Amino acid sequence: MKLNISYPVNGSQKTFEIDDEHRIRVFFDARIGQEVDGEAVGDEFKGYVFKISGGNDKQGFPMKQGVLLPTRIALLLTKNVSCYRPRRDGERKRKSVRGAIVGPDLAVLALVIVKKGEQELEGLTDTTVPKRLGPKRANNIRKFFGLSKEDDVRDFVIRREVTKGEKTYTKAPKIQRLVTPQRLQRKRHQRALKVRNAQAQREAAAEYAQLLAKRLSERKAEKAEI
Amino acid sequence: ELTVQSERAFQKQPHIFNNPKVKTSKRTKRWYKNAGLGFKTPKTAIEGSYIDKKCPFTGLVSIRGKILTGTVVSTKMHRTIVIRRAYLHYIPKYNRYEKRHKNVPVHVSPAFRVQVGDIVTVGQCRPISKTVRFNVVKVSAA
Amino acid sequence: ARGPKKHLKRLAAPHHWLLDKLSGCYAPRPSAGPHKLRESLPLIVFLRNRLKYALNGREVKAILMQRHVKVDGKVRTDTTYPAGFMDVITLDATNENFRLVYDVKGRFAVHRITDEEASYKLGKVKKVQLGKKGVPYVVTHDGRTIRYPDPNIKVNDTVKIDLASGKITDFIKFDAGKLVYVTGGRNLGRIGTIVHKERHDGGFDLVHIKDSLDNTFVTRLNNVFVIGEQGKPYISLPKGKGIKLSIAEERDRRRAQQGL
RNA sequence: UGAAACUGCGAAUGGCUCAUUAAAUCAGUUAUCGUUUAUUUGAUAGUUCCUUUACUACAUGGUAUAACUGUGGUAAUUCUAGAGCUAAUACAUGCUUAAAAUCUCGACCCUUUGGAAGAGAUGUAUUUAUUAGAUAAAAAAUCAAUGUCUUCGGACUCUUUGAUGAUUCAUAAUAACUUUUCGAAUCGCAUGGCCUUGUGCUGGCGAUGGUUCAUUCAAAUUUCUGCCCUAUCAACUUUCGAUGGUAGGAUAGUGGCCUACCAUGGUUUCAACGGGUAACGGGGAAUAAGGGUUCGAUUCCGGAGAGGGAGCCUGAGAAAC
């Protein structure tokens, strides 16, 4: 072999296998992607520019842009490194990976594609699939449907129909960031809480200073006299 | 000894300054202190050239908690000694005591010149060695 | 055993908390108090095993939640708030006002006060430092942190604050003839004199006192808390003034008082 | 309505069992000013971009794939491979913001007891210096930078100050630090204020996150004081860590934990080290005048194993059986 194709631009994708072996010879070492062509790979692919991606080997373990080997290995992984998932803030496990350098031992790999070729494929090149979700910060949306910085979005905000069958309802986002006559109010409540505090300490500081000094001043008729 | 550098490494009581540019009279400093706890801070301390950090008075070791003695037993260590404390203990059964003793490892400064036999008060430092804890503070000769 | 303990085996709770001995495997304990752990309390005790105002402990979460009891004029909705000697605990339902302070016997006590008097408290002074930007400050057994204060104030007295504010109204001194409540030690739960500190100096300072019946005595400097000049004792004091009785006397007053 | 699966959190409890273990487990108290802490409970982040007049989507951006499909291999096992697909609170990013304060530059003016437009940083978690962080009581000078008012001789008058038995703590303050932690691209139910009538300006309740800080259920290590039989066991340990120093690595931390160099110490007839134990400890059970003698593998509290031995993946939480 299956292959695991992913034409981005539209977003699609598909699964065409090759099961011939002499039209297969290729990919067989160019590590992860080092562009594999698509004339000796399959002639539904022709001038197609098939980046190698990565994907699964057999018995069937992950492949890793890192391993430097067509071998089968079993290093220590980390919350960070992928091949892996950490089941604990601060924890590490041993597993296996047949490395990024291809060879026959594969059920699957990925073809993601750069410059599509002359020849037409069906259910990637054909079919699309949405733009699935949608952005957020308006300032991403001026990046998206502009908004005329000033006129403000609210307006062309992205949303969705959605069906009770008989009473469709309009589920919608929540921005975050949005400068209000709330938000500002808090820059706000802060500054005058900065100043507020300050005219307090300055004042004590001195009121102590002169109170300490209605004494040290009297320290002096506090000798000769009482 | 007595000659002060001797310990390749040079010596000084840390944070002390003297001022080869500026009129110098007295040339040297010192830093000293006064233990405390009813003591007397002798004069071979504010006089004595020597260095030793582990000095009570000429250096950076505090004295807190025991105050105790006794009878010196051996001195053979380059600035450190040993004490006995022959004590008594009351077995509840034969209703009578025994002469028991523990020995004690302690630092010591050149300010005191102790032979064996002498009665001797001591303090109790942070820790100062592997064993080692107390610092002599007052000798009690013949 | 590795970090610090987070539980408290009942038995191990202090014996004046007076806690049962059965049913509750576990007592509490208090978390990170402005108080000291042992000579203190939680409201989870003071609000079922003492007063009544709870039945369960679930019930005692439910009175607090409601933000309906203020310690030192401030809410708390801990459940094991580490309250102590000197405190305010105000009842919002109820103007009902308890100053924590020991029995005579030995206790804690249940002492009502004078919605006026919740007002202030008797800040102990526990140390003194020019601290941080070069500013002096006293830090109060209440585990509480007080700034720009006068220099006349020294090491070992109180200072009336205002709860509403952390002011430092009036301070008292430590001198051969002032009243003294004894905080902790056989004599906790008594007043009240300073006959004579007995300096020394590692450390151990010692004190002499007497009382209203002329009995006397000698305890640690540590465990002393001035309150006023003989008279005006800056409170109130619970019954029996806080007095001590050769049980030869106590038995009597329960024989005097046989009435039902 | 809901099979399956994508994430989520569970499985580290619980049950059994006692072989090992003799100052070790363990009981009674101690400490955390020696550390980590899923949740649960309570407080909690307007200065995110970017040299900021024609800005980055925030009316919400993009990858990939499980299931499912179909084409399979093997005697065989909870075996998987190569293909066309599709979502997330998966996977990865990246806007949103107020007023203020404050700091370090200084275009110009003016030689004064030196002012100045606007230029950026300050949001938080990181790292590291350094400073404050006062206060056991009352009083004379010169400054070295000049903080407040000029009665144009100077002053400085009420000047802030938390806890601790105890700190370098608690938090703040500067100069930079970081393969930059976070600051909501969610979600079910109600769905209505008013217009400047775009299905817009604005609006309930509730969830699931989530940065910290306390908390809390904890763990870890930890003082003291306590063990049965043996001298036909009287001297032990420092091969190579035995006992301390100093510094680093190590840890969630402390500490010969381990290593660099150093010093020669620490235990011992008041029974150490060795040998035995058909020893897991205790609460307690039998016996029962008093004092006692034996037994507590076993219904609760600790610890230890998972057939021996080791090492480690996940997760806060395992040396897991």
CB C170 within 8 A of CB C234: yes
Q: What angle do CA C149, C86, C69 make, to 5 degrees?
A: 110
* Residues forming a β-bridge with C128: C138
**DSSP-assigned letter for residue A191:** H
Contact assignment for C201 to B37 by CB distance below 8 Å? yes
Report the C-alpha gap between A50 and A34 in whole angstroms.
9
A170 CA to D48 C1' distance (Å): 30
Resolution for this experimental structure (Å) = 3.7
Residue C252 lies in a domain: no
What element of type H or E holds B81? Answer: strand B81-83
Q: Quick check: C140 and C146 in contact, CB under 8 A? A: yes
Question: Both C129 and C164 in a single domain?
Answer: yes
Chain B residues close to C200, C-beta within 8 Å: none
Is residue C4 located within the same domain as residue C102?
yes
Contact check, Cβ <8 Å, A208/C148: yes
Report the residue of chain C nearest A201, measured CA to CA: C148
C-beta atoms of A212 and C151 within 8 A: yes
Gap from C21 CA to D296 C1', Å = 26
Test A204 with C151 for CB contact under 8 angstroms: no
Domain that holds residue C164: 121-171
Helices (H), chain C: 43-46
Asked if residue C127 and residue C223 are part of one domain, the reply reads no
Quick one: C42 and C140 in the same domain? Answer: no
C:156-175 Cβ neighbours of strand D under 7 Å: 166-168
For strand D, list residues 115-144 of chain A whose Cβ lies within 7 Å of it: 121-124, 127, 129-144
User: Strand D positions with any atom < 7 Å from protein CB?
Assistant: 11-12, 28-33, 35-37, 41-43, 45-49, 54-66, 68-71, 79-88, 94-101, 131-140, 156-167, 169-172, 183-189, 191, 198-202, 214-222, 243-246, 252-253, 263, 265-266, 270, 311-318
Taking the C1' atom of every nucleotide in all shown strands and the CA of B99, the nearest one is D270
Look at phi and psi of residue B132 and say left if phi exceeds 0, alpha if psi is from -120 to 50, else beta.
left
Residues of A in contact with C150 (CB under 8 A): 211-212
Closest residue, chain A, to C167 (C-alpha): A204
Is B20's Cβ below 8 Å from some Cβ in C? Answer: no
Q: Exposed (0-12), middle (13-18) or buried (19+): which is A84, by Cβ within 10 Å? A: middle
Domain ranges, ordered by start, for chain B? 1-142
Q: Which nucleotide is nearest to A191 (CA to C1')?
A: D100
Task: Compute the distance between CA of residue C258 and CA of residue C260 in angstroms, rounded to an integer.
Answer: 8
The answer to whether residues C14 and C35 belong to one domain is: yes
Residue at token pair 């495997």: C25
Query: What's the domain count of chain C?
Result: 3
For residue C63, is it within any domain?
Answer: yes
Q: What is the dihedral of CA C164, C166, C167, C170, to 10 degrees?
A: 100
What residues contact B96, with CB distance under 8 A and at least 6 apart? B90
Residue type present at position B15: H
d(C-alpha A103, C-alpha C196), whole Å: 96
For residue C203, the distance in angstroms to the closest alpha carbon of chain B comes to 8
User: C48 and C110 in one domain?
Assistant: yes
Flag whether C26 is in a domain. Answer: yes
Tokens matching residue A113:
């594609």
Distance CA B18, CA B27 (A): 7
Closest CA to C79 of C27, C36, C144: C27
Residue C167: both structure tokens together: 């002011």
Chain C hits for B64, CB-CB cut-off 8 Å, are 202
Is residue C108 located within the same domain as residue C6?
A: yes
Structure-determination technique: cryo-EM
Question: Same domain for C155 and C187?
Answer: no
Contact across the interface for B65 and C202, Cβ inside 8 Å:
yes
Q: Cβ atoms within 10 A of the Cβ of C86, count?
A: 21
Query: Searching chain C, which residue's CA lies closest to the CA of residue B123?
Result: C202
Q: Could you tell me if C146 and C139 are in contact, meaning their C-beta atoms sit under 8 angstroms apart?
A: yes
Whether C66 maps to a domain, the answer reads yes
Residue nearest to nucleotide D188 (CA to C1'): A171
| Residue A156 CB lies within 7 Å of the nucleic strand D | yes
- Closest approach of chain C CAs to the CA of A208, in angstroms? 6
Asked whether residue C249 is assigned to any structural domain, the reply reads no
Query: Measured between CB atoms, does B92 come within 8 Å of chain C?
Result: no
Check: CB of residue C228 under 8 Å from CB of residue C172: yes
Q: Answer whether residue C36 is part of any domain.
A: yes
Contact C197, C221 (CB under 8 A): yes
Distance CA B88, CA B101 (A): 9
Identity of the residue numbered C225: F
Contact present, C140 and C126 (Cβ < 8 Å): yes
Q: What's the token pair of residue C199?
A: 């300096």
Decide which of C90, C116, C142 is a domain's last residue. C116
Nearest to C242 by CA among C182, C174, C173, C184: C182
How many angstroms separate the CA of C174 from the C1' of D229? Answer: 63
Q: Is C132 in the same domain as C98?
A: no
Whether C258 maps to a domain, the answer reads: no
Distance CA A48, CA A57 (A): 24
In a shared domain, residues C83 and C139: no
- Report the alpha-carbon distance of residue A107 to residue A4 in Å, rounded: 10
Does residue C96 sit in the same domain as residue C178?
no
Asked if the structure places residue C253 within a domain, the reply is: no
Stretch (H or E) spanning A212: helix A201-212
Provide the CA A187 to C1' D159 distance, Å, integer: 30
Tokens of A56: 């699964």
Measure Cα distances from C188 to A45, A81, C15, C86, C216 in Å. Answer: 94, 63, 13, 14, 14
Beta bridge partners of B83: B104
Please compute Rg for chain A using Cα positions.
34
Torsion region of A177: left, alpha or beta (phi above 0 gives left; psi -120 to 50 gives alpha): left
In B, which residues are within 8 Å of C201 by CB distance? 37
Distance CA B75, CA A132 (A): 88
Rounded Cα distance between C190 and C241, Å, is 8
From the CA of B67, how many Å to the nearest CA of chain C? 10
Name the C residues in 181-210 with CB < 8 Å from any B CB.
201-202
Q: Give the single-character DSSP code of C252.
A: G
Scanning residues 161 through 220 of protein chain A, those with a beta carbon under 7 Å from any atom of strand D turn out to be: 169-192, 194-195, 198, 200-220
Q: Strands across the sheet with C98-99, in order? A: C69-71, C88-91, C98-99
* Nearest chain B alpha carbon to C201: B37
Distance A66 CA to D15 C1' (A): 46
DSSP A84-147: ---SSSS-------B-SS-----S----------SS--SS------------------------
* Residues C112 and C126 grouped into a single domain: no
Give the whole-angstrom CA distance, residue B6 versus residue C137: 48
Using DSSP's 3-state secondary structure scheme, residue C208 falls into coil
Looking at residue A15, the DSSP 8-state letter turns out to be: -
Q: Does the beta carbon of C150 lie under 8 angstroms from any beta carbon of chain A? A: yes
